[PDB]
Amino acid sequence: RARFVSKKGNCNVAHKNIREQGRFLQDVFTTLVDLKWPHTLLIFTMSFLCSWLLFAMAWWLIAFAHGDLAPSEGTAEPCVTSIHSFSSAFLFSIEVQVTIGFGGRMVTEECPLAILILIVQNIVGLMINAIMLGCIFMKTAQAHRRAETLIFSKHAVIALRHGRLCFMLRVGDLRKSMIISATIHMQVVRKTTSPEGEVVPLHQVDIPMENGVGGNSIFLVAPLIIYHVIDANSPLYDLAPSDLHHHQDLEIIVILEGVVETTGITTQARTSYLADEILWGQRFVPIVAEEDGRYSVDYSKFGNTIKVPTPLCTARQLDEDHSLLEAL
Amino acid sequence: RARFVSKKGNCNVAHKNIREQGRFLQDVFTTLVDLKWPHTLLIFTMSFLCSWLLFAMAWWLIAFAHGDLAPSEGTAEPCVTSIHSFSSAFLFSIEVQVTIGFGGRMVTEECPLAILILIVQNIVGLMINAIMLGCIFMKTAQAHRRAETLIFSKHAVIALRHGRLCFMLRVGDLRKSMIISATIHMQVVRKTTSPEGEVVPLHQVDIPMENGVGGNSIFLVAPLIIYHVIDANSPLYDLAPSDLHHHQDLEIIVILEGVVETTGITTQARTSYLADEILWGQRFVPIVAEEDGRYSVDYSKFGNTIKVPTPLCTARQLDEDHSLLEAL
Amino acid sequence: PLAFCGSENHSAAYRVDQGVLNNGCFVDALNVVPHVFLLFITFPILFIGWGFPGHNLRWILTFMLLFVLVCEIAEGILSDGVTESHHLHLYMPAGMAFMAAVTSVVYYHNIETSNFPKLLIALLVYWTLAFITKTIKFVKFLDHAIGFSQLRFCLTGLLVILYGMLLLVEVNVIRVRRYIFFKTPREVKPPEDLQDLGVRFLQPFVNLLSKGTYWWMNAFIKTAHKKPIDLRAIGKLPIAMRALTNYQRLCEAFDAQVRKDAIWQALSHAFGRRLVLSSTFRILADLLGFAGPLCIFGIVDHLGKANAYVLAVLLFLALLLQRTFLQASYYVAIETGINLRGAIQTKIYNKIMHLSTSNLSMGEMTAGQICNLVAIDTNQLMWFFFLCPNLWAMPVQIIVGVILLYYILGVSALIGAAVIILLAPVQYFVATKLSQAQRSTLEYSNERLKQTNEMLRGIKLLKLYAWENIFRTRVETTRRKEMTSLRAFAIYTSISIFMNTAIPIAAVLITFVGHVPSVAFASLSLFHILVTPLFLLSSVVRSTVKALVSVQKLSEFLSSAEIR
Amino acid sequence: KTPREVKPPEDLQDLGVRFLQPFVNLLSKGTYWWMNAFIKTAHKKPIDLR
Amino acid sequence: EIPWRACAKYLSSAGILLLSLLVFSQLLKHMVLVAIDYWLAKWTDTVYAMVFTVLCSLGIVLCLVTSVTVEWTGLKVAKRLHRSLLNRIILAPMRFFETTPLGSILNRFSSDCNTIDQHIPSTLECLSRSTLLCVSALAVISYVTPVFLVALLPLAIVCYFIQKYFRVASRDLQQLDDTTQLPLLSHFAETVEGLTTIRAFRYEARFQQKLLEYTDSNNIASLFLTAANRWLEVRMEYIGACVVLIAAVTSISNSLHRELSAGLVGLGLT
Ligand SMILES: Nc1ncnc2c1ncn2[C@@H]1O[C@H](COP(=O)(O)OP(=O)(O)OP(=O)(O)O)[C@@H](O)[C@H]1O
Ligand SMILES: Nc1ncnc2c1ncn2[C@@H]1O[C@H](COP(=O)(O)OP(=O)(O)OP(=O)(O)O)[C@@H](O)[C@H]1O
């Protein structure tokens, strides 16, 4: 009995034997973007090191083939001025590819092959530099830094609203930065079965949020309550108190999707509630108060609730007894 | 009695005691993007200064450990050519990291440790440069410059349309640049209460705009009027004239969300109307006229309205008297 | 010019390396690299916002470090006066150290809000670097140095020990918050924010620095200009205000009763540690400030024929710490007074709730004086525990003053101190005399209060029966007795005032005549400083007397008959 | 804080139907650059009272 | 303004000859203190000895007349105050008594006259000696180093502005302290005067909680007071420390460079 999604958005499911291989040479960029910072740093640094050393070996080899390390006779001019050790060729490669070019060690017309090497190293340097910079960009424009500030109470409560027994939960945003088109997809998951008999382990039913329009967008500035009204079409219409417990196959997946204000990109936070975390018969205490010329969202006691009794039977039996009391 | 959102989109709510801390080392980028220009400028400048000075101290210390400041004997060759003062090492660090490299002061093979320092400073320079450039990019691609041009009249009017009493307001876009998928979410907010008794301070009900399709997208080229038809399902169906006033707990939050034409990113403008700004019984005068071979949106007198009487009772009592007059 | 340790070829052959670490210039420069490192790694991540176990120990270390770095800057600038090239390596490292310590302070303060202590361990590596460099400097300073400035040796080892203690603080906070690679953060239960809940007015969330200097109170006053304050515009209590105080007082009275199985004993047993804490502040303060005249003597005699500058600015720093400690001493005591006021009002009110009516109806107590005791007794005890620490503080001060006179210019035949030595009997005598008078003054005040109360109760009766000349002159008699007693009181307090201000000139005269430059006036300066406490002692003893009699009346009231 | 911002009749009081110097600068108010623009259309199109 | 007028009526209760004697006493007293010790400065580089002693004697006798004048004027003012007020009050008609609440008009004899007659002289002499030693030492440190005046001038302006700032804070504060202190005495009068009823209703815990709240309120008000007072204390102290430093530095530089009888240097710095 695992959690489908962790209380912090971790999709707690392993793949175990994908058939095929990955992307030929594009998975490099995607797998590169989302990755721990020091590892990415190290990869780029070591790319620069290998690019420098490779052409360093190249220049050194060229100077040595030109017969330029031994003679120093004064007459024959080098392919590249004043290099006498592999250290020299390495300094030269760094000067070239980093576009520093001090000048004490300089390419000469005496070796057109050396000119080819220069062109090659410049092209490679620009290509690798642009790749590194595009990667560093799309990494520094990363999302899900905000997706951690989007908080959700550890518990969800049900209560009576409009004479109806509706499942609720409070949502929370901690950043003053605003999410755009914030959309809710509450989704109950369990191992359910069709009448014909087929059962699927993680079945998924999009349970609709009760919105005056009916849509799924919200406008979260002050941390509010998301809630579903349990209708005879809702799968939770057979739910009862004391049926919920950490050993009851039941879970409602909560999805929050919107656009970051500063970065036009989209992020998603996930939270889940299995049966026990769904507290029966409570109400989230209002954590907002009219401050002095302001609205005071007391973020303390954020998910703190209050217990309230209720008819301790299914919304099914709710409508049963209600019809029996109304047709009386 | 504060305004939920200012007449200019300011979410006038403080957080006051968030539990946890921020993002470990990613909040740096987000908090960096949206921030006053001179402060960001200064931060980057001072990053470059500290990066230059640190390696300046490094090079100076290396020259001094090599015993290269005192002798000038002519025989022993420096780690780096021709540096004699910390000023020299600082100029050298600037030449290196900015990739200038004049040449009068140049790295030599005599100190492999100096070569390590060179590699280190080049890697750090490229990393810091890419970070600064990614930040400057995602800052210069900033939104909400357009979100200020999306204007909204200081007042909203109600009138009779289709024999029905519908709440209205005019929207305005001042830029010729177009917003894509411009979507409206009018949302009334007050301290309302369920029948069971629970009250929430800033309750939020998405009041649906009257659209021939029913959806919430618009196509704003000429500044038009947004309006809600007040039905028995609308919370405003118990509203009456003279109930509106600046001391009546009432406010309707207006959200505009779309994609900027030039920058594919999304922006959001906010405006709000509490009870008094909701002028009862008026109509926004048509500010458009068929120009000479053109459509003349007289942006002057933009929100200027005209007073019109009306049955001065609730849409509830409207339907009451209407049913009494139709079943007669 | 502006060379690190640069002089002509004689010293241009100094930066040479006959052994790298043997060059003092080299280790001197290396001791700058860490401070540079921190000062430039932390500024950006500080300007991003600007643009916790082991608080007390860390801060004690940091301020001791501050003081000794000031000392080192002084030593450097002094020892640079012998050369003529202004080789700035003597002090520049210490200036970077000053700045780096300040930055460490401000940085950790702004990180303590949202500590990502993996971001805080930058301090770990940094202090390790600084410690390593200073240990290297010290070791190589054992040999290779004349050590003619033994102060250089002491300060070097001193900084080594301070960096080591800082590192130990760092491993302490690490272990407590084991995060670095360990799994258990032992994270938090901070009442400073949590228990506050959003309605509070006090020091705890503020740092020790402001807890000494009232920066938060500066902010609090900041609004009082732009807007008139209001009672809703007011902070709430601390969670330990006047309820835990009352419980502690009841529990300490229970402990004192078990000991028994006056009330001063219970009060002290409940309360004395905070008082001796405020006292300890006062003692450390005035003892430090007592090194004031020494600076004056040094000034004058160093001028007699440049270290007087650094000595004067040393006195400056001394007075800075001096009065920032006087503030601590005073505020702890005024806070004490507030707590005792609340607790005693609570206890008195409980006694009221248990008061027997017959006691009020038939005899001793009238509502007037029963409320007058909490009205005035409490204020007087509050003021007594304002002047509380000074009492235990002055004798320690006066003894050190005498000892210094014996070791300072008045080394022998300073006899004029015997004047103040004989003054303490004069003080105690004026005390007991004021005490003899105070009972009569207080009883006459109470009589007149009973008079006027009773009078203006049925003042219509008096207006009607024309007995107001009669009752008014009757009260005038009481007021005349009170006037006479207060007249003796005023005579005696004027005697105390004159004796107070008169004994210093007596002392200076007797000392300076005892002889038959710096010495005379330095002693006179000390005499100013020593007469400073006496001027306040004048009222200290008065408040002492009044508090004694007031607690007498308190115990008088507490022993009353109770309904049960 | 106080911009003492504006009440410009040059644009506002004009309301969109005007023909004169005020919105034009003193320079054109001496040299009729706006009138140059006004005549500019009189070539491409015959003027009318509307 | 208001303080000038209130203190002027206070001293007006005393004989004008008391104003003369007090002012001459303070001034001559501490100007002789300055004279004797600044002239001891002339001693550090006998006749001067004997007249030095007679200056000491003048100082002591003038201190005695000073303190005696202080006590006697305080007592005379208190006497005139109590008698005149008692007379004018008892002589007021019934409209006042029936209109004005008794507790107020009573408190001015109860605690206000108490405050006056046994704390005014203490505070007045404290203020008098403090301000006069102050202004004297100011003038003297100006004199011994005529350079110091230029440093002194901005510091006085800073003092003036920040102290007016603190006072505009502390007036509102002290008013709040008064208005938070009154309900204590009110609830106590209620507690005692209606004690039997409260015991009957058995609601003692309720009024106990109410008084706990009242006391907490007074305590928080007083803590406001103290925080403010200590903040100003700190600021003024740091001003004084800056003063000391300036004087010492200026004097040392001048003297050792431009000789000036360094005894005067020690004098200014002390
Ligand atoms: N285990 C798997 N992991 C990843 N991809 C798979 C896997 N099985 C099939 N696919 C992909 O899905 C596509 C269509 O799936 P299909 O149902 O044909 O699988 P299949 O060829 O029948 O293999 P299998 O019998 O294992 O399902 C194929 O192109 C294949 O690449
Ligand atoms: N005041 C708050 N500010 C920010 N985040 C919070 C706050 N309270 C709780 N959270 C976060 O929300 C998540 C679930 O909240 P939960 O309802 O468990 O709060 P809690 O642990 O009960 O604390 P509290 O009792 O203060 O609500 C937790 O992971 C927690 O980090």
Author numbering:
A (entry chain D), B (entry chain A): 32 to 359
C (entry chain E): 2 to 52, 68 to 277, 286 to 329, 353 to 563, 573 to 620
D (entry chain F): 199 to 248
E (entry chain E): 994 to 1038, 1061 to 1285
Paper passage:
Cryo-EM reconstructions revealed two major conformations. One is similar to the published structure (‘propeller’ form) with the exception that the NBDs are closed in our structure. Upon further classification and refinement, the propeller form was determined to 5.6 Å resolution and the quatrefoil form was determined to 3.9 Å resolution. In addition, the L0-loop is clearly visible in the propeller form albeit at lower resolution. In the propeller form the ATP-binding site on Kir6.2 is buttressed by the lasso extension, which attaches SUR1 to the CTD. The consequence of holding the transport modules at a shifted position with respect to the pore in the propeller form should be strain exerted on the lasso extension/Kir6 interface in the propeller form. When we compare the NBD-dimerized propeller form in this study with the published NBD-open propeller form, we observe that dimerization causes a slight tilting of NBD1 away from the center of the complex.
A broad and rich body of literature based on decades of study describes the biochemical and functional properties of KATP channels (Aguilar-Bryan and Bryan, 1999; Aguilar-Bryan et al., 1998; Ashcroft et al., 2017; Ashcroft and Ashcroft, 1992; Hibino et al., 2010; Nichols, 2016; 2006). These channels were found to be large oligomeric complexes composed of four sulphonylurea receptor (SUR) subunits, which belong to the ABCC family of ABC transporters, and four Kir6 subunits, which are members of the inward rectifier potassium channel family. By virtue of their sensitivity to both ATP and ADP, these channels are thought to couple cellular metabolism to membrane excitability. Three naturally occurring ligands control the activity of KATP channels: PIP2 is required for activity, ATP inhibits activity, and ADP potentiates activity.
